[PDB]
């Protein structure tokens, strides 16, 4: 049975703002980094060892992978970044919140967007406050016209996301090499959504927890055993 | 002309750096943290971009360049890691400091080794506390059996790494792509030698300053343009 495991980047500086970050750059929390800390020890107590490591181009996710490499003693491992495992480009409505989103666009259209598996945001135009901040980003240069978002449905971000898993991902998990991913959640969504066959509605209430270790066991065509489990103490998974 | 940018980590745990450390996988003091810490905001304070880092496996140097890249913003950068970018492998010598090194092996041989360029040290006999834990560490299983040193002269070290620099670094360059290394004394001393056409005798009394970025202005032969240059205070 191969082993595969997934993280959700730990508690970010605007997720305790309830500011949608989408494609910004936004840090860890301190809580956020204690989570990551903790997945890292549950890891580390389980001996899990790994043999290379995938994640986004965003620091959230790229220093929950630190901080776990760190706990589990493995920073000398492979480590392969890539904008096709970033979250979801949240188009006009990055950077803002909760009450923003909802005075600017109504309690309606939020909850279509909500529910929507393949209805957008609106695209984050040239005057939007972080237009440059994100799609100006020199990390980006290398991404085509088509490829470089205004915004995403999470239909858009499932179908970048899963050619890197197919061209990259898939053969060193074939090849037997123990694969570590760290992601954020809607990136990760398409994953769980391929491996468990999932629909497009269920695929939408299913919530990662952030800076939790999940656990797949896969079969010789990468279809789970078992249920995904989280790692962790009781206190944690409880939860 | 293409900038190329070295770092040498900083002191390492249990004054390791000066106890042979070798391929003993010793994390950062916090000394040495903090010295990673100053030569990133000399980076970060002196606007420098770059495209892609390499680093060995070892746990100091790739502490040192997370801490660089956390400063400067550049996090998301391409990593490469490689055994040859490695510290020294001081072999048997591993751990001990100058005195017990003379006690153990008499002076003559301490000697012969302190001014040596290709005089190795001795390999870890099975009873040195860092056998097991070098020689059977997972991140060397894919060496073949003449690849995984049991012990290094600087001669050795420096042959082992420049095919890593001639093979993944120079075509990197020569695209453009503007290269940050974080790694160590005796290896970075490899890289050193090989850009300025230094002598063994030139090369050995050489020694780089720790957790101050260095940078080189190459030509398109990649041949220096000017000395190196420290960066900081
Ligand atoms: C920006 N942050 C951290 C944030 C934003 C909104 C909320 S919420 O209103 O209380 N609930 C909540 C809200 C939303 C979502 C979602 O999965 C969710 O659970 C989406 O997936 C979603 C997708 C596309 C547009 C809007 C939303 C949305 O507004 C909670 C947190
Ligand atoms: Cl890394």
């Known amino acids: 049975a191969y082993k595969l495991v997934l993280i959700r980047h730990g508690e970010s500086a605007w997720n305790l703002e309830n500011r949608f970050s989408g494609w910004y750059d936004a840090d860890l929390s301190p809580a956020g980094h204690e989570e990551a800390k903790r997945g890292g020890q549950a890891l580390r107590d389980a001996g899990y060892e790994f043999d290379i490591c995938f994640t986004s181009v965003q ?118 090499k123990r694969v570590l991913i760290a992601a954020h959640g809607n990136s990760l969504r398409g994953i769980v959504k391929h491996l468990e066959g999932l629909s497009e509605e269920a695929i939408m209430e299913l919530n990662l927890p952030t800076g939790i270790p999940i656990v797949y066991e896969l079969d010789k065509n990468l279809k789970p055993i078992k249920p995904m489990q989280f790692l962790g103490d009781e206190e944690t998974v409880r939860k």
């Open 59 to 176: 620091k959230r996710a790229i220093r929950t992978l630190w901080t776990v490499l760190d706990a589990i003693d493995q920073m000398w491992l492979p480590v392969v970044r890539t904008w096709r495992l970033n979250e979801r480009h949240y188009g006009g409505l990055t950077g803002l919140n909760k009450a923003e989103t909802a005075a600017k666009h109504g309690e309606a259209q939020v909850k279509i967007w909500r529910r929507s598996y393949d209805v957008p945001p609106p695209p984050m135009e040239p005057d939007h406050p972080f237009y440059s901040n994100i799609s100006k980003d020199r990390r980006y240069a290398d991404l085509t016209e088509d490829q470089l978002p205004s915004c995403e449905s999470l239909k858009d971000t499932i179908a970048r996301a899963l050619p890197f898993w197919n061209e990259e991902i898939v053969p060193q998990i074939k090849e037997g």
